[PDB]
Amino acid sequence: IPEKLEYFINKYAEHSHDKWSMDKLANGWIYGEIYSDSSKIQPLMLLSEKEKEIYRWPIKESLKTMLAWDLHAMAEMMAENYHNIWAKKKKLELESKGGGNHPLLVPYDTLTAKEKAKDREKAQDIFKFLQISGYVVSRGXXXXXXXXXXXXXXXXXXXXXXXXXXX
């Protein structure tokens, strides 16, 4: 984790908290020490102490896979990681408890479209802030190169053909 990105971690957490506060003021949520959902009372105005931070916690984790692994490519890869971590915890806990089978125990190329969009939403939400701050990220002529490779292959084949015709 870079020092500059670690600096922006807190500010992006505050901006996501501001967006969620803005949604919850659209809903109607007033601060109150008592924990409830039917009374519309929560002590950080339904996000509890740890649940106000549960979505900030994996931002640094996305940073680690970002550095360890164009914009659409990073988006789909981050969505894949976001669903894979949840699938890992789900499979681990179901193997521990001996529970039932979850229809998300399938590779990511088979999931339903809504299951991809659910984590694609969070992926784009975190990526827009990296984009506005100027962080040029990739995954980490083409036709002319392909033609050149084809020509090289043809040269090899021609060498082989010359060797064959010599015989």
Side-chain angles (χ1 to χ4, degrees), residues 63-98:
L63 259 319
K64 320 184 3 180
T65 150
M66 183 191 187
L67 309 172
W69 293 356
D70 52 314
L71 267 301
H72 88 120
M74 278 291 302
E76 308 211 15
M77 301 280 201
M78 189 46 55
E80 166 180 282
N81 182 30
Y82 280 162
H83 200 296
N84 221 335
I85 192 55
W86 187 94
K88 278 160 171 58
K89 196 187 178 41
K90 178 53 193 169
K91 72 162 69 65
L92 246 60
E93 69 200 88
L94 66 91
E95 292 151 335
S96 67
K97 63 169 239 150

mmCIF file of all heavy atoms in Angstrom, residues 63-98:
data_model
loop_
_atom_site.group_PDB
_atom_site.id
_atom_site.type_symbol
_atom_site.label_atom_id
_atom_site.label_comp_id
_atom_site.label_asym_id
_atom_site.label_seq_id
_atom_site.Cartn_x
_atom_site.Cartn_y
_atom_site.Cartn_z
ATOM 1 N N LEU A 63 -6.863 -2.585 -3.230
ATOM 2 C CA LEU A 63 -5.574 -1.999 -3.566
ATOM 3 C C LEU A 63 -4.494 -3.082 -3.686
ATOM 4 O O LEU A 63 -3.660 -3.040 -4.602
ATOM 5 C CB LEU A 63 -5.214 -0.943 -2.531
ATOM 6 C CG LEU A 63 -5.444 0.527 -2.897
ATOM 7 C CD1 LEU A 63 -5.046 0.802 -4.322
ATOM 8 C CD2 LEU A 63 -6.900 0.955 -2.639
ATOM 9 N N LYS A 64 -4.510 -4.073 -2.786
ATOM 10 C CA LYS A 64 -3.494 -5.124 -2.844
ATOM 11 C C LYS A 64 -3.625 -5.973 -4.098
ATOM 12 O O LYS A 64 -2.619 -6.273 -4.749
ATOM 13 C CB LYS A 64 -3.555 -6.024 -1.610
ATOM 14 C CG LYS A 64 -3.803 -5.302 -0.299
ATOM 15 C CD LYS A 64 -3.756 -6.253 0.896
ATOM 16 C CE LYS A 64 -3.401 -7.688 0.473
ATOM 17 N NZ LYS A 64 -3.345 -8.637 1.625
ATOM 18 N N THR A 65 -4.845 -6.383 -4.451
ATOM 19 C CA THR A 65 -4.981 -7.165 -5.681
ATOM 20 C C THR A 65 -4.727 -6.304 -6.915
ATOM 21 O O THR A 65 -4.208 -6.799 -7.920
ATOM 22 C CB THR A 65 -6.336 -7.863 -5.780
ATOM 23 O OG1 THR A 65 -6.697 -7.989 -7.163
ATOM 24 C CG2 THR A 65 -7.413 -7.109 -5.034
ATOM 25 N N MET A 66 -5.083 -5.018 -6.859
ATOM 26 C CA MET A 66 -4.727 -4.071 -7.909
ATOM 27 C C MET A 66 -3.230 -4.077 -8.189
ATOM 28 O O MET A 66 -2.797 -4.191 -9.343
ATOM 29 C CB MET A 66 -5.175 -2.670 -7.484
ATOM 30 C CG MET A 66 -4.947 -1.568 -8.492
ATOM 31 S SD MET A 66 -5.242 0.035 -7.705
ATOM 32 C CE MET A 66 -5.139 1.197 -9.065
ATOM 33 N N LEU A 67 -2.424 -3.923 -7.138
ATOM 34 C CA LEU A 67 -0.978 -3.850 -7.327
ATOM 35 C C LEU A 67 -0.375 -5.222 -7.630
ATOM 36 O O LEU A 67 0.612 -5.319 -8.368
ATOM 37 C CB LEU A 67 -0.319 -3.224 -6.099
ATOM 38 C CG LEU A 67 -0.887 -1.888 -5.609
ATOM 39 C CD1 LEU A 67 -0.274 -1.498 -4.272
ATOM 40 C CD2 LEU A 67 -0.670 -0.785 -6.635
ATOM 41 N N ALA A 68 -0.954 -6.297 -7.088
ATOM 42 C CA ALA A 68 -0.370 -7.623 -7.261
ATOM 43 C C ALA A 68 -0.748 -8.287 -8.582
ATOM 44 O O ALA A 68 -0.028 -9.184 -9.035
ATOM 45 C CB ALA A 68 -0.778 -8.524 -6.092
ATOM 46 N N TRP A 69 -1.851 -7.883 -9.208
ATOM 47 C CA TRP A 69 -2.274 -8.504 -10.460
ATOM 48 C C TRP A 69 -1.668 -7.781 -11.660
ATOM 49 O O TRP A 69 -0.514 -8.017 -12.018
ATOM 50 C CB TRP A 69 -3.802 -8.519 -10.569
ATOM 51 C CG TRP A 69 -4.471 -9.417 -9.569
ATOM 52 C CD1 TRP A 69 -3.860 -10.241 -8.668
ATOM 53 C CD2 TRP A 69 -5.880 -9.584 -9.375
ATOM 54 N NE1 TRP A 69 -4.802 -10.905 -7.921
ATOM 55 C CE2 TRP A 69 -6.050 -10.521 -8.335
ATOM 56 C CE3 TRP A 69 -7.015 -9.026 -9.973
ATOM 57 C CZ2 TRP A 69 -7.309 -10.913 -7.881
ATOM 58 C CZ3 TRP A 69 -8.265 -9.418 -9.520
ATOM 59 C CH2 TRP A 69 -8.400 -10.353 -8.487
ATOM 60 N N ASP A 70 -9.014 -1.912 -20.529
ATOM 61 C CA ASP A 70 -8.169 -1.472 -19.423
ATOM 62 C C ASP A 70 -8.982 -1.101 -18.181
ATOM 63 O O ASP A 70 -8.913 -1.793 -17.167
ATOM 64 C CB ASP A 70 -7.286 -0.299 -19.867
ATOM 65 C CG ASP A 70 -8.074 0.822 -20.516
ATOM 66 O OD1 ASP A 70 -8.936 0.528 -21.372
ATOM 67 O OD2 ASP A 70 -7.832 1.996 -20.168
ATOM 68 N N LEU A 71 -9.749 -0.011 -18.253
ATOM 69 C CA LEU A 71 -10.603 0.368 -17.130
ATOM 70 C C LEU A 71 -11.757 -0.614 -16.974
ATOM 71 O O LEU A 71 -12.045 -1.081 -15.868
ATOM 72 C CB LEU A 71 -11.125 1.792 -17.320
ATOM 73 C CG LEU A 71 -10.292 2.892 -16.661
ATOM 74 C CD1 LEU A 71 -10.224 2.647 -15.167
ATOM 75 C CD2 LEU A 71 -8.895 2.979 -17.261
ATOM 76 N N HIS A 72 -12.427 -0.934 -18.081
ATOM 77 C CA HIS A 72 -13.398 -2.021 -18.094
ATOM 78 C C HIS A 72 -12.780 -3.351 -17.673
ATOM 79 O O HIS A 72 -13.429 -4.142 -16.974
ATOM 80 C CB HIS A 72 -14.025 -2.102 -19.488
ATOM 81 C CG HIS A 72 -13.262 -2.964 -20.447
ATOM 82 N ND1 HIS A 72 -13.801 -4.076 -21.055
ATOM 83 C CD2 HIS A 72 -12.001 -2.847 -20.928
ATOM 84 C CE1 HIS A 72 -12.896 -4.619 -21.850
ATOM 85 N NE2 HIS A 72 -11.796 -3.893 -21.792
ATOM 86 N N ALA A 73 -11.529 -3.607 -18.062
ATOM 87 C CA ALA A 73 -10.869 -4.839 -17.643
ATOM 88 C C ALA A 73 -10.696 -4.882 -16.131
ATOM 89 O O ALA A 73 -11.043 -5.883 -15.491
ATOM 90 C CB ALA A 73 -9.519 -4.976 -18.344
ATOM 91 N N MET A 74 -10.159 -3.808 -15.549
ATOM 92 C CA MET A 74 -10.013 -3.725 -14.101
ATOM 93 C C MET A 74 -11.362 -3.827 -13.405
ATOM 94 O O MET A 74 -11.469 -4.427 -12.331
ATOM 95 C CB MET A 74 -9.315 -2.420 -13.717
ATOM 96 C CG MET A 74 -7.803 -2.465 -13.831
ATOM 97 S SD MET A 74 -7.055 -3.535 -12.589
ATOM 98 C CE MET A 74 -7.663 -2.781 -11.083
ATOM 99 N N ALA A 75 -12.406 -3.250 -14.004
ATOM 100 C CA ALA A 75 -13.740 -3.331 -13.420
ATOM 101 C C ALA A 75 -14.220 -4.774 -13.343
ATOM 102 O O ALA A 75 -14.696 -5.229 -12.295
ATOM 103 C CB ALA A 75 -14.717 -2.475 -14.225
ATOM 104 N N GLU A 76 -14.102 -5.514 -14.448
ATOM 105 C CA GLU A 76 -14.570 -6.897 -14.429
ATOM 106 C C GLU A 76 -13.705 -7.768 -13.524
ATOM 107 O O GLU A 76 -14.222 -8.656 -12.839
ATOM 108 C CB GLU A 76 -14.623 -7.464 -15.848
ATOM 109 C CG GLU A 76 -15.385 -6.595 -16.831
ATOM 110 C CD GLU A 76 -16.056 -7.405 -17.921
ATOM 111 O OE1 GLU A 76 -16.173 -8.637 -17.760
ATOM 112 O OE2 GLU A 76 -16.463 -6.811 -18.940
ATOM 113 N N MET A 77 -12.394 -7.512 -13.478
ATOM 114 C CA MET A 77 -11.534 -8.280 -12.582
ATOM 115 C C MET A 77 -11.855 -7.991 -11.118
ATOM 116 O O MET A 77 -11.860 -8.905 -10.284
ATOM 117 C CB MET A 77 -10.063 -7.993 -12.877
ATOM 118 C CG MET A 77 -9.641 -8.310 -14.302
ATOM 119 S SD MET A 77 -9.310 -10.056 -14.594
ATOM 120 C CE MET A 77 -8.270 -9.952 -16.050
ATOM 121 N N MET A 78 -12.144 -6.730 -10.787
ATOM 122 C CA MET A 78 -12.486 -6.389 -9.412
ATOM 123 C C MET A 78 -13.839 -6.971 -9.029
ATOM 124 O O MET A 78 -14.035 -7.401 -7.887
ATOM 125 C CB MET A 78 -12.479 -4.871 -9.234
ATOM 126 C CG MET A 78 -12.620 -4.400 -7.793
ATOM 127 S SD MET A 78 -11.560 -5.280 -6.627
ATOM 128 C CE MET A 78 -9.940 -5.039 -7.362
ATOM 129 N N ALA A 79 -14.782 -7.008 -9.974
ATOM 130 C CA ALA A 79 -16.055 -7.678 -9.723
ATOM 131 C C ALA A 79 -15.849 -9.168 -9.474
ATOM 132 O O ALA A 79 -16.452 -9.749 -8.558
ATOM 133 C CB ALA A 79 -17.001 -7.456 -10.903
ATOM 134 N N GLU A 80 -14.999 -9.801 -10.287
ATOM 135 C CA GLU A 80 -14.689 -11.214 -10.097
ATOM 136 C C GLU A 80 -14.088 -11.465 -8.720
ATOM 137 O O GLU A 80 -14.465 -12.422 -8.038
ATOM 138 C CB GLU A 80 -13.739 -11.686 -11.198
ATOM 139 C CG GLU A 80 -13.084 -13.032 -10.942
ATOM 140 C CD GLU A 80 -12.148 -13.440 -12.064
ATOM 141 O OE1 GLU A 80 -12.643 -13.900 -13.114
ATOM 142 O OE2 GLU A 80 -10.919 -13.296 -11.898
ATOM 143 N N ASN A 81 -13.163 -10.605 -8.289
ATOM 144 C CA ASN A 81 -12.566 -10.766 -6.964
ATOM 145 C C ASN A 81 -13.593 -10.553 -5.857
ATOM 146 O O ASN A 81 -13.596 -11.281 -4.854
ATOM 147 C CB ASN A 81 -11.399 -9.797 -6.791
ATOM 148 C CG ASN A 81 -10.707 -9.954 -5.452
ATOM 149 O OD1 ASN A 81 -10.680 -11.042 -4.877
ATOM 150 N ND2 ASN A 81 -10.158 -8.860 -4.940
ATOM 151 N N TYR A 82 -14.462 -9.550 -6.016
ATOM 152 C CA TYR A 82 -15.470 -9.270 -5.002
ATOM 153 C C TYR A 82 -16.430 -10.438 -4.840
ATOM 154 O O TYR A 82 -16.875 -10.734 -3.724
ATOM 155 C CB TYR A 82 -16.238 -7.999 -5.356
ATOM 156 C CG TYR A 82 -15.517 -6.721 -5.000
ATOM 157 C CD1 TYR A 82 -15.890 -5.511 -5.568
ATOM 158 C CD2 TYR A 82 -14.468 -6.722 -4.091
ATOM 159 C CE1 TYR A 82 -15.238 -4.339 -5.244
ATOM 160 C CE2 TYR A 82 -13.811 -5.557 -3.760
ATOM 161 C CZ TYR A 82 -14.198 -4.369 -4.338
ATOM 162 O OH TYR A 82 -13.539 -3.213 -4.003
ATOM 163 N N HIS A 83 -16.770 -11.112 -5.938
ATOM 164 C CA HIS A 83 -17.660 -12.255 -5.789
ATOM 165 C C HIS A 83 -16.902 -13.498 -5.338
ATOM 166 O O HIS A 83 -17.467 -14.345 -4.636
ATOM 167 C CB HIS A 83 -18.413 -12.532 -7.090
ATOM 168 C CG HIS A 83 -19.658 -13.341 -6.897
ATOM 169 N ND1 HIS A 83 -19.644 -14.640 -6.437
ATOM 170 C CD2 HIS A 83 -20.962 -13.019 -7.072
ATOM 171 C CE1 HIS A 83 -20.882 -15.089 -6.351
ATOM 172 N NE2 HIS A 83 -21.703 -14.125 -6.729
ATOM 173 N N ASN A 84 -15.618 -13.604 -5.694
ATOM 174 C CA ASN A 84 -14.831 -14.770 -5.312
ATOM 175 C C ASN A 84 -14.542 -14.788 -3.817
ATOM 176 O O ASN A 84 -14.526 -15.858 -3.205
ATOM 177 C CB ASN A 84 -13.527 -14.810 -6.107
ATOM 178 C CG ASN A 84 -13.171 -16.210 -6.571
ATOM 179 O OD1 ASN A 84 -13.582 -17.200 -5.966
ATOM 180 N ND2 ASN A 84 -12.397 -16.299 -7.646
ATOM 181 N N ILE A 85 -14.302 -13.623 -3.209
ATOM 182 C CA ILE A 85 -14.036 -13.605 -1.770
ATOM 183 C C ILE A 85 -15.278 -14.033 -0.992
ATOM 184 O O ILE A 85 -15.195 -14.804 -0.021
ATOM 185 C CB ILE A 85 -13.513 -12.222 -1.326
ATOM 186 C CG1 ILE A 85 -12.968 -12.284 0.104
ATOM 187 C CG2 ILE A 85 -14.578 -11.138 -1.460
ATOM 188 C CD1 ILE A 85 -11.902 -13.339 0.310
ATOM 189 N N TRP A 86 -16.456 -13.577 -1.428
ATOM 190 C CA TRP A 86 -17.693 -13.989 -0.777
ATOM 191 C C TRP A 86 -17.969 -15.467 -1.008
ATOM 192 O O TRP A 86 -18.413 -16.167 -0.093
ATOM 193 C CB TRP A 86 -18.865 -13.145 -1.276
ATOM 194 C CG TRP A 86 -20.132 -13.397 -0.517
ATOM 195 C CD1 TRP A 86 -20.597 -12.699 0.559
ATOM 196 C CD2 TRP A 86 -21.096 -14.429 -0.771
ATOM 197 N NE1 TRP A 86 -21.790 -13.227 0.987
ATOM 198 C CE2 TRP A 86 -22.118 -14.289 0.188
ATOM 199 C CE3 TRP A 86 -21.194 -15.453 -1.718
ATOM 200 C CZ2 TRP A 86 -23.223 -15.135 0.228
ATOM 201 C CZ3 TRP A 86 -22.290 -16.291 -1.675
ATOM 202 C CH2 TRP A 86 -23.291 -16.128 -0.709
ATOM 203 N N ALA A 87 -17.718 -15.960 -2.224
ATOM 204 C CA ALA A 87 -17.900 -17.383 -2.490
ATOM 205 C C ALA A 87 -16.947 -18.222 -1.650
ATOM 206 O O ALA A 87 -17.310 -19.306 -1.185
ATOM 207 C CB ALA A 87 -17.709 -17.671 -3.978
ATOM 208 N N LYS A 88 -15.725 -17.728 -1.435
ATOM 209 C CA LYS A 88 -14.760 -18.438 -0.603
ATOM 210 C C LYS A 88 -15.238 -18.518 0.837
ATOM 211 O O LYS A 88 -15.213 -19.592 1.449
ATOM 212 C CB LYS A 88 -13.395 -17.754 -0.677
ATOM 213 C CG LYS A 88 -12.565 -18.140 -1.886
ATOM 214 C CD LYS A 88 -11.487 -17.108 -2.166
ATOM 215 C CE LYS A 88 -10.526 -17.607 -3.228
ATOM 216 N NZ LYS A 88 -11.227 -17.932 -4.501
ATOM 217 N N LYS A 89 -15.684 -17.393 1.398
ATOM 218 C CA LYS A 89 -16.165 -17.439 2.775
ATOM 219 C C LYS A 89 -17.412 -18.312 2.893
ATOM 220 O O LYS A 89 -17.563 -19.062 3.866
ATOM 221 C CB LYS A 89 -16.437 -16.030 3.303
ATOM 222 C CG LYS A 89 -16.559 -15.997 4.822
ATOM 223 C CD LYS A 89 -16.987 -14.646 5.378
ATOM 224 C CE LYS A 89 -17.138 -14.723 6.893
ATOM 225 N NZ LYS A 89 -16.045 -15.517 7.525
ATOM 226 N N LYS A 90 -18.307 -18.246 1.900
ATOM 227 C CA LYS A 90 -19.517 -19.061 1.932
ATOM 228 C C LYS A 90 -19.187 -20.547 1.864
ATOM 229 O O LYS A 90 -19.718 -21.340 2.650
ATOM 230 C CB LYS A 90 -20.451 -18.668 0.785
ATOM 231 C CG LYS A 90 -21.725 -19.501 0.710
ATOM 232 C CD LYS A 90 -22.456 -19.509 2.044
ATOM 233 C CE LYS A 90 -23.534 -20.579 2.071
ATOM 234 N NZ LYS A 90 -24.079 -20.794 3.440
ATOM 235 N N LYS A 91 -18.308 -20.943 0.938
ATOM 236 C CA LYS A 91 -17.943 -22.351 0.830
ATOM 237 C C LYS A 91 -17.215 -22.822 2.082
ATOM 238 O O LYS A 91 -17.452 -23.938 2.557
ATOM 239 C CB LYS A 91 -17.101 -22.594 -0.428
ATOM 240 C CG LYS A 91 -15.674 -22.063 -0.384
ATOM 241 C CD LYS A 91 -14.803 -22.710 -1.450
ATOM 242 C CE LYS A 91 -15.211 -22.271 -2.847
ATOM 243 N NZ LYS A 91 -14.988 -20.815 -3.065
ATOM 244 N N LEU A 92 -16.360 -21.972 2.655
ATOM 245 C CA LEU A 92 -15.644 -22.343 3.868
ATOM 246 C C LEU A 92 -16.612 -22.574 5.020
ATOM 247 O O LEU A 92 -16.545 -23.600 5.711
ATOM 248 C CB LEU A 92 -14.632 -21.253 4.220
ATOM 249 C CG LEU A 92 -13.159 -21.645 4.136
ATOM 250 C CD1 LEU A 92 -12.824 -22.082 2.721
ATOM 251 C CD2 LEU A 92 -12.277 -20.486 4.557
ATOM 252 N N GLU A 93 -17.540 -21.638 5.227
ATOM 253 C CA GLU A 93 -18.464 -21.776 6.343
ATOM 254 C C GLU A 93 -19.432 -22.935 6.136
ATOM 255 O O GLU A 93 -19.804 -23.601 7.109
ATOM 256 C CB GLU A 93 -19.226 -20.467 6.584
ATOM 257 C CG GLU A 93 -20.231 -20.080 5.507
ATOM 258 C CD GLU A 93 -20.584 -18.603 5.543
ATOM 259 O OE1 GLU A 93 -19.879 -17.793 4.904
ATOM 260 O OE2 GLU A 93 -21.569 -18.251 6.224
ATOM 261 N N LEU A 94 -19.836 -23.216 4.892
ATOM 262 C CA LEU A 94 -20.745 -24.338 4.682
ATOM 263 C C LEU A 94 -20.018 -25.669 4.832
ATOM 264 O O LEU A 94 -20.607 -26.650 5.301
ATOM 265 C CB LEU A 94 -21.434 -24.248 3.316
ATOM 266 C CG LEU A 94 -20.664 -24.367 2.001
ATOM 267 C CD1 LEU A 94 -20.618 -25.810 1.532
ATOM 268 C CD2 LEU A 94 -21.335 -23.502 0.946
ATOM 269 N N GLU A 95 -18.738 -25.727 4.452
ATOM 270 C CA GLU A 95 -17.955 -26.922 4.747
ATOM 271 C C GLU A 95 -17.761 -27.096 6.247
ATOM 272 O O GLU A 95 -17.677 -28.230 6.732
ATOM 273 C CB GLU A 95 -16.599 -26.864 4.043
ATOM 274 C CG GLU A 95 -16.666 -26.966 2.531
ATOM 275 C CD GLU A 95 -15.521 -26.239 1.855
ATOM 276 O OE1 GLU A 95 -14.965 -25.303 2.467
ATOM 277 O OE2 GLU A 95 -15.170 -26.609 0.716
ATOM 278 N N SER A 96 -17.692 -25.993 6.993
ATOM 279 C CA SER A 96 -17.519 -26.091 8.439
ATOM 280 C C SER A 96 -18.796 -26.568 9.127
ATOM 281 O O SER A 96 -18.747 -27.423 10.020
ATOM 282 C CB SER A 96 -17.074 -24.741 9.002
ATOM 283 O OG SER A 96 -18.100 -23.775 8.863
ATOM 284 N N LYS A 97 -19.951 -26.030 8.725
ATOM 285 C CA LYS A 97 -21.220 -26.313 9.394
ATOM 286 C C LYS A 97 -21.988 -27.481 8.785
ATOM 287 O O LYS A 97 -23.017 -27.879 9.342
ATOM 288 C CB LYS A 97 -22.124 -25.073 9.381
ATOM 289 C CG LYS A 97 -22.533 -24.612 7.988
ATOM 290 C CD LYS A 97 -23.619 -23.554 8.035
ATOM 291 C CE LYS A 97 -24.853 -24.000 7.277
ATOM 292 N NZ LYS A 97 -26.076 -23.405 7.873
ATOM 293 N N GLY A 98 -21.535 -28.028 7.661
ATOM 294 C CA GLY A 98 -22.277 -29.107 7.025
ATOM 295 C C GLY A 98 -23.661 -28.706 6.563
ATOM 296 O O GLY A 98 -24.630 -29.439 6.799
#
